């Protein structure tokens, strides 16, 4: 009888549960069960099997087009949110944004001190910065990182990846780096643990996971330079067993009154513009936020239109880079 909600575990899932799920479910007087997953294809497997157990799934904005095309997502009720309260394009007919985050470069201060990599060109430069690299085992942010390393200006990432030539060169760049990649991390918590144990010299991972590891004593530093500004959000699984209750739950948790608490401990940025007026975050708090003006200036936004067209190519080609060893 519980609504089943799933995200990717660790500090991020804990932040959503504390700020959004527990207070929203209390207000609606409903019960819910949590689950965890890393790949949107796991939601597809539930749909393909004919046994859907998940109701709400937290996915990345760039997985939304391929999930919707594969018939994995329920169409949401018309006025689930007022689109004017959220960033443009962050709310689709099948997805409601809950946050902005960054896929960024972090480095081990024991290895490099303050003179760590401060750009993707630096991250890919094994001669100037020798050491163990860690990259995600999924391609969003990883293909673009290679395009940036090749010298592509931040505002031209997706123009470069719009051609076959550019897409192949980006994979060739990742192939070149692959022998220096000690671990292809799978979850944010695993990435945070690699950082806390100093098991890697540099890593491309999510800002909240990095800041959480540093708060826990990791001797790492990071930059927003060349980071990808992402958007996470919620969708309802096609054939969700508690579809109607899940719709009410998603509408409630998207409210400004809950969104304001999302970054209380975890370094994330709420997507609901009204949450900023309620919480009145200090400039120190804003500095860790992916969407703060000073951080946006050195980032580029993920392009869901690119991922709508090339996700299948990207998944297979990147699988081969990591399988090359
Ligand atoms: N929004 C945030 O502050 C969290 C950022 C980050 N979330 C990564 C997600 O895009 C990712 O796990 C996707 O949900 C997943 O691949 C399926 O779409 C994290 O798990 O630390
Ligand atoms: Ca994502
Ligand atoms: Ca974590």
mmCIF file of N, CA and C and ligand atoms in Angstrom, residues 58-63 101 103 136 138 140 206 228 231-232 302, ligand 2:
data_model
loop_
_atom_site.group_PDB
_atom_site.id
_atom_site.type_symbol
_atom_site.label_atom_id
_atom_site.label_comp_id
_atom_site.label_asym_id
_atom_site.label_seq_id
_atom_site.Cartn_x
_atom_site.Cartn_y
_atom_site.Cartn_z
ATOM 1 N N UNK A 58 13.568 9.331 -9.426
ATOM 2 C CA UNK A 58 14.332 10.558 -9.589
ATOM 3 C C UNK A 58 15.313 10.258 -10.717
ATOM 4 N N UNK A 59 15.214 11.016 -11.812
ATOM 5 C CA UNK A 59 16.101 10.864 -12.967
ATOM 6 C C UNK A 59 16.768 12.187 -13.329
ATOM 7 N N UNK A 60 17.785 12.119 -14.190
ATOM 8 C CA UNK A 60 18.441 13.317 -14.702
ATOM 9 C C UNK A 60 17.641 13.827 -15.895
ATOM 10 N N UNK A 61 17.596 15.156 -16.074
ATOM 11 C CA UNK A 61 16.853 15.789 -17.175
ATOM 12 C C UNK A 61 17.232 15.219 -18.552
ATOM 13 N N UNK A 62 18.505 14.815 -18.731
ATOM 14 C CA UNK A 62 18.990 14.309 -20.020
ATOM 15 C C UNK A 62 18.646 12.840 -20.265
ATOM 16 N N UNK A 63 18.134 12.108 -19.234
ATOM 17 C CA UNK A 63 17.652 10.733 -19.442
ATOM 18 C C UNK A 63 16.155 10.746 -19.749
ATOM 19 N N UNK A 101 22.541 20.918 -10.058
ATOM 20 C CA UNK A 101 23.796 20.407 -9.512
ATOM 21 C C UNK A 101 24.880 20.560 -10.590
ATOM 22 N N UNK A 103 28.426 18.645 -12.462
ATOM 23 C CA UNK A 103 29.323 17.514 -12.708
ATOM 24 C C UNK A 103 30.661 18.232 -12.870
ATOM 25 N N UNK A 136 32.683 8.609 -14.247
ATOM 26 C CA UNK A 136 31.418 7.895 -14.073
ATOM 27 C C UNK A 136 31.345 6.709 -15.053
ATOM 28 N N UNK A 138 28.624 5.959 -16.500
ATOM 29 C CA UNK A 138 27.543 6.377 -17.411
ATOM 30 C C UNK A 138 28.029 7.639 -18.150
ATOM 31 N N UNK A 140 26.635 10.750 -19.439
ATOM 32 C CA UNK A 140 26.231 12.173 -19.309
ATOM 33 C C UNK A 140 27.279 12.975 -18.523
ATOM 34 N N UNK A 206 29.755 14.612 -8.935
ATOM 35 C CA UNK A 206 28.742 15.598 -8.572
ATOM 36 C C UNK A 206 29.152 16.424 -7.348
ATOM 37 N N UNK A 228 29.560 20.885 -15.716
ATOM 38 C CA UNK A 228 28.295 20.823 -16.434
ATOM 39 C C UNK A 228 27.182 21.100 -15.426
ATOM 40 N N UNK A 231 20.340 19.209 -14.172
ATOM 41 C CA UNK A 231 19.024 19.312 -13.559
ATOM 42 C C UNK A 231 18.532 17.911 -13.226
ATOM 43 N N UNK A 232 18.160 17.691 -11.970
ATOM 44 C CA UNK A 232 17.556 16.422 -11.558
ATOM 45 C C UNK A 232 16.087 16.695 -11.323
ATOM 46 N N UNK A 302 23.756 21.224 -19.394
ATOM 47 C CA UNK A 302 23.534 19.959 -20.120
ATOM 48 C C UNK A 302 22.485 20.238 -21.220
HETATM 49 CA CA1 LIG B 2 22.040 12.520 -15.211
#
